[PDB]
Amino acid sequence: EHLEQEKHELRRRFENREGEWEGRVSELETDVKQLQDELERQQLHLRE
Amino acid sequence: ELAAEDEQVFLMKQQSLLAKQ
Amino acid sequence: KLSLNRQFFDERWSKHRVVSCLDWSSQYPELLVASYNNNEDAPHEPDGVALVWNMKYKKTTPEYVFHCQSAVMSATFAKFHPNLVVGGTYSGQIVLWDNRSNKRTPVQRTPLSAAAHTHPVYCVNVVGTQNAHNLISISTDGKICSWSLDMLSHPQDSMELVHKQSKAVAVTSMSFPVGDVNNFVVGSEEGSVYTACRHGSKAGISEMFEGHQGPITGIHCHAAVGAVDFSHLFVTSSFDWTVKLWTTKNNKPLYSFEDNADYVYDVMWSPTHPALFACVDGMGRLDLWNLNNDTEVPTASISVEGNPALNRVRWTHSGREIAVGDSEGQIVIYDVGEQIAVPRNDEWARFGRTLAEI
Amino acid sequence: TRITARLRDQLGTAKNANEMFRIFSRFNALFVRPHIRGAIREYQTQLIQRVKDDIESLHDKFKVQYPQSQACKMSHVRDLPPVSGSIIWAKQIDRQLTAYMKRVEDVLGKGWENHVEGQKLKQDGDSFRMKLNTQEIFDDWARKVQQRNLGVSGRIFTIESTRVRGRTGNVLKLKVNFLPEIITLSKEVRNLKWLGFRVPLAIVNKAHQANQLYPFAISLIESVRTYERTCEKVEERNTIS
């Protein structure tokens, strides 16, 4: 029973940190996308 | 005559079990 | 112009409750079923209540009463089972009431198992032919389940609705085109409508719309059918005070109305007039917009006495009357003027030209 | 010059700020010509007064606090938890304030803020905008939730006591080990993530797990309810006991 409880808590912390990793990856990709948009805008301003 | 424990008596038994813990 | 015709209010049952839903029976167009959630003022009373009133008689008493342990978030008539009234509750049990039975408790209620619904159900409908009919219900978890009215032990079909990256769609409202049974439209709390397919290769959510920036309050498809088909059109109300007129083909707004200085809580087409539609807000205003006459200002407007916050609105089948339920468990019926409600033969072409213009 | 007569025609009908914007919205080609802009400048000083009233009225709606407002009552109807409900109610007001400010830019053109009238209205809008901050509400909830330390834990079942009419002893009814607030955190965290607030990862865990425990939790109370509902049948007829 103690092994079973430990296994369940490991699955739980596993999934929680996995969701955290997905959120971090999505936020960094959002930063990359926004900053690329700003680079496009600045190049357009350069040509203007 | 085996008879199912009533809800009240079985739950008083479970109260006794939980309380001592 | 709107004329106050009839007001329904039961002191014992409807008092201190919100009106959760409304519907008119097809075979009995003079019959109106309304829902009521739990009353905080009366915890001992039944939480869910559902009252059916009548218009042919002038008696104020509710023609039929029903109640249940769970608060009724939605209700409707069974189109092909005239004795039956279907309801979806807060806990997710699809309750059913038979008017023949003297019992007020639901004769049937679905399990709330993993197979069945497991969240509040805000939209239920019976769609199909007289030969074939299916009870589609959706919960706030995105689970959509088809049931048979004859058996509510286990659904006909069941799945969960997602659109991208397996993100659950908290569905808040739903509608169908006229005559269609496989393809439907759902307005979630995202502010994003989804055209979805019930069954087939592409079953699930087919399209996204960005649209509203707040929760959608109601979604309703075009009901009037005539010379020019407009079933591809639909309307969406939201918490953002805005009412958006859309079509299936375009992915972006065809038009958005923002005259309302309050949360617009429901929107609905007329069943006869193609351009006309109605909406109701929480400030206490019911507004009729006739896009043939104007896509600019309410064609008609009316405020219920005391300005109670209007929650639900339902057009009658004939299109000559509108019923509205407020946050006080009080129903108001307004007869529409014949000039507005009755469509002229050119109203269809007028709405076609208006849609071409935008 | 004919349009100038129409500019007389259209404003005399319209008294509300919104009304003037619609007819003003129609005149899209004439924002290039500084002949109609002067005829707009005839009316400009009025339109800042009109939109000031809408923002005033919008501020008046904000004066009534969210719990007092009808929105809180009917948000409660529509399974919207309170803290998220207050945030959403505030967010819409801020957006409609922004919507009015965009009309002013259309009415007064670009660089309107430099106008003496423009400075005053902009100051009025900014102060109201500050009052509509929604970060203050979300942060307090994260602190308060962490103070409460929600977690189902305990046991799968934790029996509670209920007084039943017609029985002198308290009737113990089997209950799934659960608290009413735990429902709200599932909805609050779900709402807040869409709103854009970065919920604490700890509270994120406590909320989803209760959400993931909800199907099993309601699955169990069916067994409790069915086993209960079966028992009254046995109570009805002592013979089959």
XYZ file of C-alpha atoms in Angstrom:
668
model
C 0.000 0.000 0.000
C 2.840 2.419 0.762
C 4.421 1.624 -2.611
C 1.066 2.287 -4.281
C 0.681 5.671 -2.573
C 4.239 6.611 -3.539
C 3.588 5.572 -7.149
C 0.422 7.672 -7.331
C 2.142 10.746 -5.906
C 4.977 10.280 -8.395
C 2.457 10.169 -11.255
C 0.843 13.318 -9.871
C 4.035 15.364 -9.512
C 5.091 14.045 -12.921
C 1.961 15.406 -14.592
C 2.090 18.718 -12.709
C 5.682 19.497 -13.683
C 4.876 18.338 -17.228
C 2.090 20.904 -17.451
C 4.496 23.519 -16.111
C 6.994 22.637 -18.854
C 4.315 22.939 -21.530
C 3.288 26.335 -20.174
C 6.890 27.561 -20.104
C 7.473 26.366 -23.675
C 4.285 28.046 -24.893
C 5.138 31.333 -23.170
C 8.672 31.406 -24.584
C 7.323 30.636 -28.057
C 4.847 33.491 -27.612
C 7.769 35.767 -26.741
C 9.611 34.617 -29.874
C 6.529 35.216 -32.040
C 5.840 38.698 -30.645
C 9.487 39.703 -30.918
C 9.661 38.452 -34.511
C 6.583 40.560 -35.253
C 8.365 43.558 -33.745
C 11.464 42.833 -35.849
C 9.269 42.804 -38.955
C 7.731 46.114 -37.887
C 11.157 47.661 -37.285
C 12.434 46.513 -40.687
C 9.327 48.001 -42.294
C 10.039 51.218 -40.400
C 13.637 51.063 -41.643
C 12.489 50.891 -45.255
C 9.855 53.575 -44.655
C -30.604 -15.066 11.979
C -27.925 -12.990 10.249
C -29.266 -9.472 9.664
C -27.628 -6.536 7.931
C -26.457 -3.888 10.362
C -28.684 -0.831 10.238
C -27.281 2.334 8.707
C -27.297 4.041 12.107
C -25.664 1.184 14.026
C -23.040 0.528 11.348
C -22.272 4.246 11.188
C -21.985 4.487 14.980
C -19.510 1.613 14.722
C -17.594 3.574 12.081
C -17.782 6.679 14.293
C -16.246 4.669 17.120
C -13.498 3.478 14.776
C -12.721 6.947 13.395
C -12.817 8.649 16.805
C -10.137 6.459 18.404
C -7.758 6.984 15.459
C -44.507 48.294 -31.281
C -44.459 45.855 -28.358
C -47.621 45.529 -26.252
C -47.625 43.887 -22.829
C -49.940 40.885 -23.168
C -49.461 38.603 -20.178
C -47.294 38.250 -17.080
C -46.767 34.980 -15.202
C -45.571 34.817 -11.604
C -46.200 32.101 -9.004
C -45.703 33.302 -5.442
C -45.056 29.854 -3.979
C -42.674 28.475 -6.626
C -41.239 31.143 -8.942
C -40.503 33.724 -6.233
C -36.855 34.611 -5.573
C -35.597 32.468 -8.462
C -33.937 33.274 -11.771
C -35.553 32.110 -15.017
C -32.981 29.697 -16.422
C -34.567 28.729 -19.751
C -37.692 29.027 -21.886
C -39.418 27.046 -24.611
C -42.689 26.840 -26.550
C -44.283 23.510 -27.435
C -44.659 22.929 -31.169
C -47.885 20.916 -30.973
C -49.174 23.336 -28.290
C -47.929 26.796 -29.343
C -49.915 28.296 -26.435
C -47.789 26.347 -23.895
C -44.630 27.846 -22.368
C -42.192 25.885 -20.189
C -39.742 27.794 -17.983
C -36.907 26.767 -15.656
C -35.858 27.993 -12.216
C -32.686 27.249 -10.266
C -32.297 26.903 -6.498
C -33.702 29.662 -4.296
C -31.213 30.806 -1.667
C -34.111 32.185 0.390
C -35.684 28.680 0.594
C -33.000 26.001 1.084
C -35.619 23.489 2.254
C -37.598 23.941 -0.970
C -36.673 21.938 -4.074
C -33.704 23.471 -5.841
C -34.763 22.909 -9.445
C -38.262 23.919 -10.517
C -39.918 23.852 -13.933
C -43.301 25.457 -14.573
C -45.502 25.200 -17.667
C -47.910 28.098 -18.221
C -50.646 28.557 -20.808
C -51.961 31.417 -22.950
C -55.352 30.199 -24.212
C -56.602 30.380 -20.621
C -56.342 33.579 -18.588
C -55.715 31.732 -15.310
C -52.584 32.946 -13.536
C -51.828 29.644 -11.813
C -49.101 27.455 -13.368
C -50.742 24.810 -15.523
C -48.077 22.254 -14.561
C -45.445 22.172 -11.823
C -42.300 20.051 -11.652
C -39.318 20.055 -9.326
C -36.070 18.232 -8.661
C -33.229 18.064 -6.170
C -30.758 19.640 -8.628
C -31.122 23.154 -10.020
C -32.500 23.192 -13.569
C -30.057 25.056 -15.824
C -32.068 24.238 -18.961
C -35.382 22.803 -20.113
C -37.436 22.218 -23.242
C -40.424 20.347 -24.636
C -40.130 16.922 -26.229
C -41.182 17.678 -29.795
C -42.305 14.132 -30.699
C -43.339 13.061 -27.157
C -45.927 15.717 -26.235
C -46.364 14.380 -22.684
C -42.640 14.784 -21.895
C -40.524 17.733 -20.755
C -36.730 17.373 -20.808
C -34.384 19.268 -18.511
C -30.688 19.575 -17.766
C -29.672 20.338 -14.198
C -26.690 21.731 -12.328
C -25.381 18.283 -11.367
C -25.655 17.015 -14.960
C -28.608 14.631 -14.677
C -30.873 14.871 -17.735
C -34.192 14.801 -15.908
C -37.481 14.040 -17.658
C -41.037 14.834 -16.546
C -44.260 13.218 -17.764
C -47.346 15.403 -17.409
C -49.604 12.342 -17.187
C -47.935 11.167 -13.972
C -49.181 12.876 -10.825
C -45.625 12.689 -9.464
C -43.606 15.909 -9.654
C -40.193 14.275 -9.302
C -38.540 13.277 -12.617
C -39.776 9.933 -13.898
C -36.315 9.483 -15.449
C -32.884 10.909 -14.743
C -29.647 9.932 -16.429
C -26.723 8.568 -14.438
C -23.902 11.045 -13.906
C -21.316 8.336 -14.555
C -18.294 8.723 -16.800
C -20.354 7.395 -19.713
C -23.007 10.069 -19.135
C -22.686 13.781 -18.443
C -20.592 14.901 -15.464
C -21.124 18.690 -15.337
C -23.946 21.265 -15.557
C -25.943 20.941 -18.780
C -27.033 24.288 -20.223
C -28.287 23.116 -23.643
C -30.582 20.225 -24.575
C -32.569 19.688 -27.769
C -34.578 17.025 -29.594
C -33.603 17.084 -33.281
C -34.649 14.779 -36.091
C -37.671 13.694 -38.068
C -40.867 12.136 -36.767
C -39.419 8.750 -37.700
C -35.981 9.501 -36.189
C -35.342 11.835 -33.244
C -32.305 12.278 -30.987
C -31.801 14.171 -27.716
C -28.520 16.103 -27.946
C -27.241 17.480 -24.634
C -23.973 19.262 -23.855
C -22.331 19.994 -20.503
C -19.904 22.691 -19.409
C -16.985 20.223 -19.670
C -17.343 19.990 -23.462
C -18.837 16.507 -23.304
C -21.630 16.075 -25.863
C -24.032 13.141 -25.539
C -26.882 11.919 -27.736
C -29.710 10.074 -25.963
C -32.952 8.351 -26.856
C -36.020 9.787 -25.166
C -37.261 6.228 -24.559
C -34.110 5.240 -22.614
C -32.019 7.620 -20.507
C -29.958 4.877 -18.843
C -26.975 5.279 -21.182
C -26.431 7.707 -24.099
C -26.858 6.838 -27.766
C -23.501 8.442 -28.455
C -20.987 10.335 -26.378
C -17.746 12.186 -26.953
C -15.769 15.211 -25.781
C -15.379 18.264 -28.008
C -11.987 19.831 -28.756
C -10.704 22.128 -31.491
C -6.900 22.403 -31.215
C -4.283 20.815 -28.930
C -7.055 18.842 -27.149
C -8.248 21.926 -25.257
C -11.636 21.373 -23.635
C -14.433 23.620 -24.914
C -16.702 24.745 -22.067
C -19.911 24.903 -24.085
C -22.450 27.450 -22.832
C -25.020 27.537 -25.652
C -25.944 25.665 -28.805
C -28.109 25.822 -31.921
C -28.889 24.021 -35.180
C -29.833 25.079 -38.706
C -33.407 24.362 -39.729
C -33.799 20.789 -40.947
C -30.168 19.866 -40.226
C -29.303 17.082 -37.780
C -25.622 16.208 -38.378
C -24.140 19.730 -38.316
C -24.616 22.116 -35.400
C -23.115 25.257 -33.866
C -21.948 25.826 -30.286
C -21.092 29.035 -28.462
C -18.600 28.394 -25.678
C -17.460 30.651 -22.829
C -14.316 31.420 -24.851
C -16.121 34.002 -26.928
C -15.409 31.570 -29.792
C -18.181 29.874 -31.744
C -17.516 26.441 -33.234
C -19.298 24.850 -36.157
C -19.245 21.178 -35.192
C -20.327 17.845 -36.654
C -22.286 15.279 -34.654
C -21.404 12.146 -36.626
C -19.289 11.100 -39.601
C -15.643 11.268 -40.582
C -15.286 14.873 -39.369
C -17.313 14.460 -36.164
C -16.351 17.056 -33.543
C -15.460 20.722 -33.856
C -14.832 21.652 -37.489
C -14.065 25.395 -37.335
C -12.940 28.086 -34.908
C -14.134 31.676 -34.813
C -12.231 34.297 -32.815
C -15.083 36.780 -32.509
C -16.339 37.750 -29.070
C -13.750 38.757 -26.475
C -15.927 37.595 -23.564
C -18.208 34.674 -22.694
C -20.998 33.943 -25.165
C -24.424 34.129 -23.547
C -26.558 32.703 -26.340
C -26.175 31.435 -29.883
C -29.092 31.008 -32.269
C -29.300 30.065 -35.931
C -31.695 31.476 -38.504
C -35.192 30.005 -38.228
C -37.288 31.635 -40.961
C -37.279 29.665 -44.226
C -38.475 31.012 -47.560
C -37.407 32.255 -50.987
C -33.772 33.009 -50.068
C -32.108 30.559 -47.685
C -30.445 32.094 -44.619
C -29.827 28.969 -42.518
C -26.091 29.578 -42.940
C -26.521 32.721 -40.789
C -26.576 32.861 -36.999
C -26.289 35.298 -34.099
C -24.266 35.342 -30.882
C -24.768 37.359 -27.691
C -22.082 37.692 -25.038
C -21.006 39.267 -21.764
C -19.127 41.879 -23.832
C -22.363 43.881 -24.473
C -22.022 42.976 -28.174
C -24.287 40.965 -30.477
C -22.529 39.438 -33.478
C -24.216 38.475 -36.759
C -22.207 35.753 -38.520
C -22.443 33.101 -41.218
C -20.849 29.678 -41.570
C -18.770 30.523 -44.645
C -16.968 33.609 -43.336
C -14.631 33.117 -40.388
C -14.882 36.740 -39.154
C -17.727 39.073 -38.111
C -20.185 40.072 -40.789
C -21.561 42.590 -38.309
C -21.474 43.482 -34.608
C -24.050 45.525 -32.662
C -22.833 47.447 -29.597
C -25.684 49.857 -28.857
C -26.227 48.020 -25.574
C -24.745 49.655 -22.471
C -25.065 46.374 -20.540
C -24.367 42.650 -20.716
C -26.492 41.337 -23.582
C -27.783 38.049 -22.209
C -29.676 36.502 -25.088
C -30.265 36.906 -28.821
C -32.696 35.047 -31.063
C -34.068 35.192 -34.593
C -37.722 35.532 -35.377
C -39.183 32.291 -36.807
C -41.087 34.146 -39.571
C -39.422 37.470 -40.328
C -35.995 36.832 -41.915
C -34.178 40.048 -41.014
C -35.823 40.705 -37.654
C -34.268 39.399 -34.471
C -34.545 40.137 -30.761
C -32.136 40.488 -27.877
C -32.394 40.991 -24.120
C -29.881 42.544 -21.721
C -29.423 42.673 -17.959
C -30.193 46.385 -17.576
C -33.842 45.488 -18.246
C -34.175 46.120 -21.995
C -35.670 43.960 -24.742
C -34.670 45.225 -28.194
C -35.948 44.226 -31.632
C -33.558 44.892 -34.519
C -34.889 44.778 -38.092
C -31.828 44.616 -40.328
C -34.026 45.307 -43.340
C -35.231 48.522 -41.712
C -31.945 49.304 -39.959
C -28.665 47.717 -38.900
C -28.159 50.884 -36.866
C -30.708 51.283 -34.036
C -33.254 49.032 -32.266
C -36.304 48.750 -34.492
C -38.319 48.488 -31.276
C -37.412 48.706 -27.602
C -39.194 48.027 -24.331
C -38.232 47.978 -20.652
C -39.931 45.690 -18.147
C -41.409 47.522 -15.166
C -38.763 48.152 -12.535
C -36.135 47.184 -15.119
C -35.503 43.636 -13.840
C -32.470 42.035 -15.427
C -33.736 39.966 -18.356
C -32.022 36.570 -18.594
C -33.834 34.402 -21.155
C -35.929 35.205 -24.213
C -37.930 32.897 -26.474
C -39.855 33.686 -29.630
C -43.213 32.055 -30.096
C -43.537 29.842 -33.163
C -45.984 32.177 -34.908
C -43.549 35.069 -34.392
C -46.309 37.396 -33.143
C -45.257 37.187 -29.462
C -42.034 37.170 -27.447
C -41.607 35.782 -23.923
C -38.839 36.850 -21.545
C -37.748 35.583 -18.142
C -35.870 37.820 -15.713
C -33.771 37.372 -12.572
C -36.899 37.427 -10.345
C -38.668 34.333 -11.685
C -41.132 36.605 -13.494
C -42.188 36.025 -17.111
C -43.292 38.867 -19.398
C -44.978 38.377 -22.779
C -45.070 41.121 -25.419
C -47.095 40.945 -28.619
C -45.175 42.359 -31.581
C -46.867 44.760 -33.948
C -48.090 43.184 -37.156
C -46.065 45.699 -39.173
C -42.767 44.446 -37.696
C -43.457 40.740 -37.163
C -45.224 40.015 -40.462
C -42.625 39.849 -43.287
C -43.569 41.335 -46.628
C -42.706 39.384 -49.768
C -39.751 41.746 -50.358
C -38.256 41.390 -46.863
C -36.258 38.377 -48.063
C -34.765 40.296 -50.985
C -34.281 43.305 -48.699
C -32.243 41.179 -46.291
C -30.310 39.719 -49.213
C -29.410 43.221 -50.390
C -28.501 44.221 -46.833
C -26.214 41.198 -46.483
C -24.666 42.030 -49.849
C -24.056 45.580 -48.616
C -22.119 44.526 -45.515
C -20.792 72.902 -49.230
C -23.750 70.560 -49.713
C -22.130 68.165 -47.233
C -21.795 71.094 -44.830
C -25.575 71.445 -44.985
C -25.820 67.699 -44.360
C -23.443 68.205 -41.435
C -26.070 70.585 -40.070
C -28.753 68.015 -40.896
C -27.209 64.999 -39.205
C -26.166 66.467 -35.846
C -29.475 68.201 -35.137
C -31.158 64.803 -35.101
C -28.529 63.161 -32.890
C -28.260 64.003 -29.184
C -26.381 60.953 -27.873
C -22.629 60.601 -28.337
C -23.075 57.177 -29.933
C -25.641 58.535 -32.401
C -23.270 61.189 -33.735
C -20.468 58.655 -34.165
C -22.559 56.452 -36.469
C -23.466 59.241 -38.890
C -19.917 60.518 -38.401
C -18.677 57.002 -39.165
C -20.324 57.184 -42.590
C -18.118 60.106 -43.673
C -15.026 58.015 -44.272
C -13.835 59.591 -47.530
C -14.011 63.148 -46.159
C -11.364 62.790 -43.443
C -8.786 63.669 -46.126
C -10.462 67.013 -46.921
C -9.823 69.844 -44.375
C -13.158 71.457 -45.275
C -15.362 68.902 -43.551
C -12.851 68.745 -40.678
C -13.578 72.397 -39.975
C -17.278 71.594 -40.136
C -16.436 68.782 -37.737
C -14.533 71.355 -35.665
C -17.835 73.226 -35.491
C -19.220 70.224 -33.591
C -16.042 68.883 -31.950
C -16.372 70.804 -28.671
C -19.837 69.290 -28.222
C -18.738 65.698 -28.859
C -16.134 65.717 -26.077
C -18.970 66.782 -23.783
C -21.177 63.970 -25.090
C -18.562 61.223 -24.710
C -17.688 62.669 -21.295
C -21.264 61.804 -20.321
C -20.928 58.217 -21.549
C -17.692 57.813 -19.598
C -19.439 59.493 -16.669
C -22.321 57.032 -17.014
C -19.790 54.227 -17.409
C -18.155 55.495 -14.218
C -21.602 55.554 -12.606
C -21.953 51.852 -13.383
C -18.562 51.329 -11.739
C -19.699 53.290 -8.674
C -22.131 50.470 -7.947
C -19.803 47.744 -6.731
C -19.794 44.371 -8.452
C -21.628 42.450 -5.659
C -24.367 45.088 -5.645
C -24.663 44.989 -9.426
C -27.099 42.725 -11.228
C -24.045 41.170 -12.916
C -22.973 39.397 -9.718
C -26.430 37.877 -9.216
C -26.690 36.531 -12.754
C -23.038 35.552 -12.994
C -23.803 33.323 -10.004
C -26.643 31.859 -12.069
C -24.233 31.141 -14.927
C -21.603 29.065 -13.024
C -19.159 31.961 -12.952
C -17.261 32.026 -9.616
C -17.173 35.335 -7.728
C -13.550 36.480 -8.051
C -13.462 35.745 -11.774
C -16.889 37.356 -12.073
C -15.695 40.620 -10.552
C -12.670 40.586 -12.860
C -14.760 39.988 -15.986
C -17.263 42.670 -14.973
C -14.408 45.148 -14.559
C -12.651 44.099 -17.774
C -15.667 44.817 -19.978
C -16.017 48.315 -18.502
C -12.366 49.044 -19.267
C -12.836 47.857 -22.845
C -15.917 50.021 -23.389
C -13.965 52.936 -21.959
C -11.295 52.174 -24.556
C -14.007 51.933 -27.215
C -15.170 55.459 -26.379
C -11.599 56.776 -26.484
C -11.150 55.378 -30.000
C -14.258 57.260 -31.127
C -12.660 60.471 -29.830
C -9.592 59.772 -31.957
C -11.956 59.344 -34.907
C -13.929 62.465 -33.967
C -10.920 64.659 -33.164
C -8.472 62.968 -35.547
C -4.918 61.937 -34.832
C -3.100 64.015 -32.252
C -6.365 64.766 -30.457
C -4.675 64.441 -27.059
C -2.798 67.688 -27.726
C -6.160 69.486 -27.675
C -6.958 71.344 -24.464
C -10.287 69.532 -24.381
C -8.400 66.355 -25.259
C -6.041 66.653 -22.293
C -8.925 66.977 -19.834
C -10.936 64.024 -21.152
C -7.791 61.911 -21.435
C -6.998 62.701 -17.801
C -10.545 61.693 -16.859
C -10.289 58.442 -18.808
C -6.883 57.564 -17.364
C -8.049 57.988 -13.763
C -11.057 55.744 -14.377
C -8.775 53.273 -16.169
C -6.522 53.074 -13.109
C -9.555 52.294 -10.951
C -10.429 49.398 -13.291
C -7.211 47.446 -12.650
C -7.976 43.737 -12.330
C -4.519 42.588 -11.187
C -5.285 43.774 -7.650
C -8.190 41.338 -7.325
C -6.383 38.290 -8.713
C -3.315 38.719 -6.501
C -5.330 38.820 -3.264
C -7.144 35.609 -4.206
C -3.835 33.806 -4.766
C -2.668 34.885 -1.306
C -5.981 34.003 0.354
C -6.198 30.614 -1.367
C -2.655 29.773 -0.264
C -3.667 30.738 3.269
C -6.644 28.374 3.073
C -4.437 25.541 1.733
C -7.105 23.595 -0.146
C -6.621 19.890 -0.784
C -9.105 17.019 -0.615
C -6.645 14.652 1.153
C -7.963 13.035 4.363
C -9.817 9.996 3.067
C -11.921 9.107 0.042
C -14.954 9.231 2.366
C -15.280 11.391 5.478
C -18.721 10.899 6.999
C -20.653 13.903 8.317
C -23.711 14.283 10.536
C -27.177 15.565 9.609
C -30.293 16.210 11.684
C -33.273 14.486 10.036
C -36.869 15.436 10.772
C -38.722 12.718 12.658
C -35.612 11.091 14.180
C -34.331 12.102 17.617
C -30.745 11.030 16.883
C -28.573 12.690 14.277
C -28.611 10.718 11.030
C -25.155 10.150 9.573
C -25.275 10.303 5.771
C -22.290 8.971 3.857
C -20.576 11.793 1.964
C -17.653 11.958 -0.428
C -14.774 13.603 1.415
C -15.084 17.052 -0.111
C -15.692 20.749 0.588
C -17.948 23.168 -1.361
C -15.115 25.654 -1.934
C -13.124 23.020 -3.839
C -15.619 23.344 -6.698
C -14.898 27.065 -6.940
C -11.125 26.673 -7.238
C -11.567 24.396 -10.255
C -13.695 27.077 -11.909
C -11.624 30.020 -10.655
C -8.325 28.653 -11.966
C -9.948 27.637 -15.251
C -11.436 31.119 -15.623
C -8.250 32.935 -14.624
C -6.024 31.139 -17.136
C -8.263 32.253 -19.996
C -8.394 35.784 -18.566
C -4.583 35.874 -18.796
C -3.535 35.972 -15.130
C -0.633 33.688 -14.240
C -2.080 31.479 -11.509
C 0.439 30.043 -9.000
C 1.555 26.590 -10.083
C 0.664 25.260 -6.624
C -2.941 26.462 -6.855
C -2.989 25.153 -10.435
C -2.221 21.689 -9.086
C -4.820 21.810 -6.302
C -7.556 22.911 -8.710
C -7.085 20.502 -11.616
C -6.671 17.498 -9.330
C -10.029 18.237 -7.711
C -11.383 18.656 -11.230
C -9.832 15.309 -12.170
C -11.102 13.857 -8.889
C -14.598 15.212 -9.595
C -15.616 12.412 -12.044
C -14.551 9.770 -9.532
C -15.987 11.816 -6.663
C -19.409 12.103 -8.301
C -19.078 8.486 -9.413
C -18.796 7.472 -5.760
C -21.698 9.568 -4.483
C -23.862 7.768 -7.032
C -22.925 4.553 -5.236
C -23.697 6.275 -1.941
C -26.957 7.674 -3.306
C -27.972 4.388 -4.928
C -27.031 2.417 -1.812
C -28.958 4.990 0.194
C -31.947 4.954 -2.185
C -31.926 1.161 -2.044
C -32.026 1.248 1.761
C -35.279 3.216 2.038
C -36.862 0.527 -0.133
C -35.733 -1.980 2.498
C -36.963 0.384 5.214
C -40.315 0.584 3.418
C -40.811 -3.196 3.673
C -39.293 -4.860 6.736
C -40.128 -8.291 5.295
C -37.338 -8.309 2.690
C -34.743 -7.080 5.206
